[PDB]
Design a protein around this ligand. Sequence first.
Ligand code: HEM
Ligand code: HEM
Ligand code: HEM
Ligand code: HEM
Ligand code: K
Ligand code: K
Ligand code: K
Lengths: 154, 154, 154, 155, 154, 154, 154
Amino acid sequence: GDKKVIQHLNKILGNELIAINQYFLHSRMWNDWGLKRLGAHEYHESIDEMKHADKLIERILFLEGLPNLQDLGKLLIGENTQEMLQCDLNLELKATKDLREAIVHCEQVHDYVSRDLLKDILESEEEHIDYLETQLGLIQKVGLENYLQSHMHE
Amino acid sequence: GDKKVIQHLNKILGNELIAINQYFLHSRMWNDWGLKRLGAHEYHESIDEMKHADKLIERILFLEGLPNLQDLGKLLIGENTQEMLQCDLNLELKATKDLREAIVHCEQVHDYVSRDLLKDILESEEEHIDYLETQLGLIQKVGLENYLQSHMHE
Amino acid sequence: GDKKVIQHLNKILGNELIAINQYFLHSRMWNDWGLKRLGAHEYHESIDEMKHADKLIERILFLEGLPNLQDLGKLLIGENTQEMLQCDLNLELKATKDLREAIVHCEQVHDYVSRDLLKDILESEEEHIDYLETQLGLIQKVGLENYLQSHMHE
Amino acid sequence: KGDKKVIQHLNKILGNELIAINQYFLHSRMWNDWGLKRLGAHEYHESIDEMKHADKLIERILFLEGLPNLQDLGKLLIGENTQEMLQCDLNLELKATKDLREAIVHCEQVHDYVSRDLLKDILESEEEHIDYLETQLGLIQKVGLENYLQSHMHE
Amino acid sequence: GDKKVIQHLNKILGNELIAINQYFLHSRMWNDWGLKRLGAHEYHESIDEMKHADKLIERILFLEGLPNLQDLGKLLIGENTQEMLQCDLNLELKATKDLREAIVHCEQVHDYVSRDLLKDILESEEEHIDYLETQLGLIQKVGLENYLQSHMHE
Amino acid sequence: GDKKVIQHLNKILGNELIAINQYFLHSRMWNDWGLKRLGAHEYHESIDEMKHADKLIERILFLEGLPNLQDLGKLLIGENTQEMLQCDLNLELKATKDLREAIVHCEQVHDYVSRDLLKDILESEEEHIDYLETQLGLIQKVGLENYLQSHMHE
Amino acid sequence: GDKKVIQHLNKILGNELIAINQYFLHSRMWNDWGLKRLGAHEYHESIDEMKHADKLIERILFLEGLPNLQDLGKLLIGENTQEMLQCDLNLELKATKDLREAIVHCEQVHDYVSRDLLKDILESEEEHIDYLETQLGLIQKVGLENYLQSHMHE
Ligand code: HEM
Ligand code: HEM
Ligand code: HEM
Ligand code: HEM
Ligand SMILES: [K+]
Ligand SMILES: [K+]
Ligand SMILES: [K+]
């Protein structure tokens, strides 16, 4: 395994570890508030990041690297829906930037299978950014109270 | 086939081509904004127009004319939901005036089969006018924020 | 969204718009002549270009560009089977060149998801080029009258 | 022959059902025209329910050898928005319900207990409708008109 | 919506409302007399008139008129079977004339969709006339008592 | 029933009776030569003219006219496939001229039900003309021998 | 194929063409009068004649003769039920006579397959005569009015 590919994979893994926990807490926060539709969506976002982290770990081990599950960066926990959403979007913009940089490096050292893995994850982060931006646009078009209302029942 | 009948059929065809693209863009714009119910409905109007164009094209060829799929008129693209709906309405008002003129002419040269085709297309356009007026009317009764909220989910 | 990426996507979109109409007319002309297998095949090629255009449109909007459905370039309509197939082929040869330039660009600016979309479109257009070259060669191998005979029934 | 005054009361109730049938059917269609499909559908079923009540009256009248009267159509109360339409329906049912009660008292007095029974079933049904109508009007006040109509766009 | 179109639709509606009541009473009369087959058939006629009225009402509201369900013309109630049949027949010959006049006017102002609705209704009144004349002929061919006997059982 | 409407119905009916026998005989001549796909198809054209004659007869009778089945016009019988197709084509062009004339007259005396019937019949005859011109066109494009070959098996 | 056999076959065919039209118009007259049971029975007799004419056409073509579908003999149309049934019988007595002579001739020149086909047709015409004589019998036994009453419903 190329040494820097493995550092980039561990970096992306560290970003997923953060998103897993952040999305999971935001999910349960929305469930505690009775916003059950947001809560279920956010749960599914968290599970998706668990699956990404799984593939990164398996790839790092195959490359005879040491996956790092020990270092957990900073969770961005919001205190209301508008902020929680904005916090997910800020995490995703950072994650996406780290992914692009990992993919440049993989391309450069001809690790095309790691690059393919990272590109599938990048596509799924960009779908999430699409979700998030649409939600924040909806809060402006329908009003915050209507937006929350629409997210009470599953 | 009557030469003028064929110009009228191409005229109608040209108008369907415009509505296909306009409704199709308006659909995808609504989806992008998270108003999926509007997006789904408008997708279906686009497909309906596709199906009318197909039958125009087939009639023109049976009559031994040359279907004109080269000339694309002006799309009326809205910038928000009330504009988009009004744009679609303005386009249907014009399509329907053209459909009436074509039918007058078909009757006068006794092309009753073209006439009947055009009559089915008109009745469908009039149902879309019905839908569109009703939507603009709902926006006034329930208010724009409610109207949008009601179209967030399919 | 990168502004040159978006311009490339609109350029590809413009090519798909041309292909959709050209193939659709070509399908209906073949059906008008009783060459129903050609006609059904070209119908499916048209529908495929429609799906590509839809994905291009969704991507542009996600990158916050303006999809351009207004500008419709030159349709190459043949007047017999051999010309129609050659027209479709000339069109794909140009479509495919624009796709390669567009991918080079998306790669350079790290828009790997756009690259991925374009690469799928490209695979689908190279499949269409395989079919076209194959039909041209069969005309030579079995003679035009037999070729056409073989395409009367679906 | 049935009792003459019974037959007159039955034709009276029948007159009230003919009005409700037309009024409810027009309100339903106006609600559908406006995209308030859920009000449209419910009101349609109210019209249909009155059509069935009218059928049973017509049948009973003929059994008692009277002449069902379908020629005289009293005055439709047509509202011009949703709150008005619900209040018009309600005004009609308050009146229908008073007439049913008088018709039932007469039936008892002349021992036509089968006619009483038919009217008691009509009455229960018209009282349900009154429950529905006052509930909607109460909901307009609790959730606000705009929300209320919003909740009735879709079936 | 054309003022005289609406007036004509509202006149056809008036004829439908008379027919609903007339056919319904007549059904119930035949049932009270034990001619259940006649009763069942007249019940179905009534129901068809109620469906035509529904369509007229919906068309009037689309054209932005006021449906008139207030004025109720005069029911032709028969006192025996032969008379009940002739009465429905006189009423149908009238409806049929008014429909023809409504259709002339629709044609002349190009309200072709109203015309097509009117034509469907008219086709259905002509079927009812076929039935009614046939029934009157049968009374002469088989005699009244046999005709009535034949209509006792559903 | 309008007297001239009835003459026009009888005229159309006579045309149908000619088509029934001509198509039927053409069918059985194709079966006898072992061109079964032509034979099957022509059989179905004959059945269809049988259904049209049925509808004309019923209408004529309802209008109190006398259906004329006694007079049978001149059958156009070809002696080979190209001639048979052209004969069927010459017959349909005539039927179709007579249909238009009958429709003018029904419009002018307000028999809109007769007109609807004839109009269905006219659309079905134009579909037949489409099929016929396509076959003669295929003969030229694939060559007579290939065209017949392709019609050997059902 | 023997020349006089072909003449006979063409003669029987001609009789079947008269029956087809006569029975079919009778059926539709009975349906127009509301005597649906007679109408359905008579419809099936017309269909059976159509099938016989098909077999005659087929055999004539096989034997290298020209089926004659051009020369339609005289239709016996009754004005009422008893006449209509007597006209069918008169027609069948004549048909039956011609069949006998055709069969003598087939036998004499040894065309035993032609004789078998005509024998099958004869048996079916004799079944028809049985039905016809039975109906005329019943008219006498149950009275005309009862007879007609029993044929209103199918
Ligand atoms: C490295 C950290 C984690 C990894 C790699 C991980 C991985 C996974 C995987 C592969 C699944 C199966 C998902 C599927 O295929 O449907 C899963 C499920 C799940 N995870 Fe995690 N997970 C992690 C952390 C967490 C945390 C911190 C929580 C909660 C605080 C959590 C809660 C859940 C729940 C509730 C499920 C569904 C379990 C069930 O009911 O079957 N996970 N995880
Ligand atoms: C000449 C212009 C066009 C014609 C004649 C046409 C015709 C058709 C027809 C006949 C269908 C099948 C619909 C059905 O029966 O269900 C269809 C489907 C479709 N069209 Fe078009 N169309 C046109 C332009 C477009 C454009 C500009 C778009 C933009 C994307 C588009 C997008 C689609 C999509 C997504 C489908 C459904 C494909 C599937 O998933 O099966 N079409 N079109
Ligand atoms: C005039 C007094 C009327 C009576 C006694 C009457 C009676 C009935 C009855 C007994 C039914 C069957 C309902 C069921 O069992 O589900 C019915 C159905 C119906 N009625 Fe009426 N009706 C009347 C007037 C009207 C009028 C004025 C309209 C106006 C449009 C109307 C519209 C309908 C419709 C649309 C149906 C359902 C028909 C179907 O699609 O099956 N009715 N009526
Ligand atoms: C040459 C004269 C005719 C021949 C040889 C002929 C032959 C046939 C045959 C073989 C069938 C299919 C019957 C079966 O197998 O079930 C048929 C059906 C039929 N024919 Fe004729 N036919 C003739 C003329 C007529 C005429 C004058 C009429 C008048 C209307 C008519 C009306 C019909 C009808 C209604 C059917 C049933 C079609 C369906 O709906 O499937 N035919 N004919
Ligand atoms: K709300
Ligand atoms: K060949
Ligand atoms: K009897």
